[PDB]
Design a protein around this ligand. Structure first.
Ligand SMILES: *[C@@H]1O[C@H](CO)[C@@H](O)[C@H](O)[C@H]1NC(C)=O
Length: 112
């Protein structure tokens, strides 16, 4: 049971870090690192149940993903439930390639 805006971290080794992947209308895709910051990273981490983000990484730090680039130039206030609720260029709007895939490092506790 997955809905639009649902997220997951991949290829991180641990469960509290990885490449950010997000669901939309039936498929998973990645997020471009343009303007990717710590406030954006904390929205992902808290949604996934961690206390906070410690690092917002870009340039496919956890490897390049596959699928469409879902979001780009994400500007969160920090109080959002999902990256889908943050300001961005809109779903599927991006000129980036997977080598720009954004990632995060969250707290163990449960610029670009
Ligand atoms: C999350 O971590 C950053 C790092 O300094 C901090 O500014 C922020 O207040 C922390 N907590 C929350 C709930 O955002």
């Amino acid at each position: 049971a997955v809905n639009d805006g649902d997220m997951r971290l991949a290829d991180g080794g641990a469960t509290n870090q990885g490449r950010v992947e997000i669901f939309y209308r039936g498929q998973w895709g990645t997020v471009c690192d343009n303007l990717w910051d710590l406030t954006d990273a904390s929205v992902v981490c808290r949604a996934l149940g961690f206390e906070n983000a410690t690092q917002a990484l870009g340039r496919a730090a956890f490897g390049q993903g596959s699928g469409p680039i879902m979001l780009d130039e994400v500007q969160c206030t920090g109080t959002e439930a999902s990256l889908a609720d943050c300001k961005s260029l809109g779903w599927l709007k991006s000129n980036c390639r997977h080598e720009r895939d954004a990632g995060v490092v969250c707290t163990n506790e449960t610029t670009l």
